[PDB]
Design an enzyme around this catalytic site. Sequence first.
Site, PDB file in Angstrom:
ATOM      1  N   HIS A   1       0.767  -1.156  -0.041  1.00  9.65           N
ATOM      2  CA  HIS A   1       0.251  -0.031  -0.038  1.00  9.65           C
ATOM      3  C   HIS A   1       0.871   1.178  -0.067  1.00  9.65           C
ATOM      4  O   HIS A   1       0.312   2.510  -0.491  1.00  9.65           O
ATOM      5  CB  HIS A   1      -1.069  -0.055   1.098  1.00  9.65           C
TER       6      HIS A   1
ATOM      7  N   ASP B   1      -0.346  -7.873   1.900  1.00 12.20           N
ATOM      8  CA  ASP B   1      -0.046  -6.608   1.509  1.00 12.20           C
ATOM      9  C   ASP B   1       1.651  -6.280   1.782  1.00 12.20           C
ATOM     10  O   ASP B   1       2.077  -5.293   1.939  1.00 12.20           O
ATOM     11  CB  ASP B   1      -0.586  -5.848   2.878  1.00 12.20           C
TER      12      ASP B   1
ATOM     13  N   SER C   1       4.543   3.413   7.994  1.00 16.20           N
ATOM     14  CA  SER C   1       4.613   2.049   7.935  1.00 16.20           C
ATOM     15  C   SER C   1       5.505   1.349   7.114  1.00 16.20           C
ATOM     16  O   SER C   1       6.446   2.132   6.636  1.00 16.20           O
ATOM     17  CB  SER C   1       3.254   1.428   7.369  1.00 16.20           C
TER      18      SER C   1
END
Lengths: 52, 158, 158
Positions: free
Chosen positions: C36, C58, C110
Site C-alpha cells: 500500500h 499487503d 509503516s
Amino acid sequence: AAVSGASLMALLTLAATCCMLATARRKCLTPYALTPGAVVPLTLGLLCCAPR
Amino acid sequence: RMCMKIENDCIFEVKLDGKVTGYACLVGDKVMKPAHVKGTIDNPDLAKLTYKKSSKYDLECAQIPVHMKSDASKYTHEKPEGHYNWHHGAVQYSGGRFTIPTGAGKPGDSGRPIFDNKGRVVAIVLGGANEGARTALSVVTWTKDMVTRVTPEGTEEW
Amino acid sequence: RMCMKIENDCIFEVKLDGKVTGYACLVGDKVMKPAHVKGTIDNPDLAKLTYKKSSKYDLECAQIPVHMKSDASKYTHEKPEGHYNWHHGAVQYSGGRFTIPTGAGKPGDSGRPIFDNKGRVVAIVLGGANEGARTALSVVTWTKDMVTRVTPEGTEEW
C-alpha cells in the site's frame, strides 16, 4: 385439499430440517463465540460456514 | 490488593429499574455478562451490542468496540492450584473448586472476575453454594479452547 | 540505543509528492515494502529491482543486490511474550498482539521493522487500529516457513 395438505407437510418437514441444522450449528459454534480467546478450527469453520 | 486497579475498568455495572443487578467484564476482546443478570449496561457502547447468549453457560458475550479493547483485562487458561483474588475477599482454588469465605458472596454481585496472582482474569463468578463456612462458587471457568461452566450442588445465584 | 545500528542499516525511505510515504527495509536477503505504500525507493539499487506482490499479505519483496546483503538485517521467527523495541517506543506483545501507546505511530510511518531483545527483526508494521490509548498494530511476521499477516479490526492504514 390433498395437494395443499401434502405440500404443507413438505414445507413443514423442510422447515424442521432447517431448524435442526440451524440448532446444530448454534450448539456447535456458540462455545467458540463465548470463549474469550478462542477461534474455531478452520476446517469446522468451513463446514459450519463460520462468519469470519 | 492491586487487582481492583484492573477491576475498576474491566467491570461495567448492569442496571435495572434504576438499581444495580450485577456486572459485565471486558475479558480479552469479548465482554462477559451472565444471562441471569437482567437489565442493561450503564454504558451505551455496550448496550448497543448484540450478545450471542447461551442457556448452557448462563453467559452472554459480544465483540467489544474498537476503542474499549484498550482497557479490557488480560485472561489466562492457567488454573494452577493456589491463591486467587476477588473483590470481597481472597478466593482459594482446590482441584477445580473455587471457594470463598461464606457471607462474602452477596445477592447480585455475579459477573465479577476472579484474578490470578499475575493480575489476569482466570474466570467469571456466577454464584455459590452453602458449603458451610467456605462457600464453593459456580464460576464459569474456561479452558485453552472452551468455556466449561462449573456449578456445585446447592448453588444459589448470588 | 542498541537497535540504532540495525535501524540505520535496515531502513530505506519511500517518498513521494515531497514527503516520505513510508519505509522499506533489508531483511535477510529480502527488501521488504508494504504494497500500500506508494512512491519510489530512495536507493537506485532497490528501485531498479522487480518485486513479488501479495494483496493478502499487503507485502512486496525482491532479492537484494549481493553487496547489500552485507548491510541487511538479521531476522528471527521467535515471538516470546513481552515487549519489543521500535523506532517510536517499545511495542508490547500482549497475548500475541503487537500494541503501542496511541500517538506513537504516525500516519504513513509503516514498513518499519520491530526488533527483539537481540536486535533481530521479528515483524513489519503496517497501519494500526485506533485502539483507544493502546493502538494495536497491523503486522506482517513469519514462521519457520511462511509469512503471515495480523490485522486488528478497526485498523486505519497508516
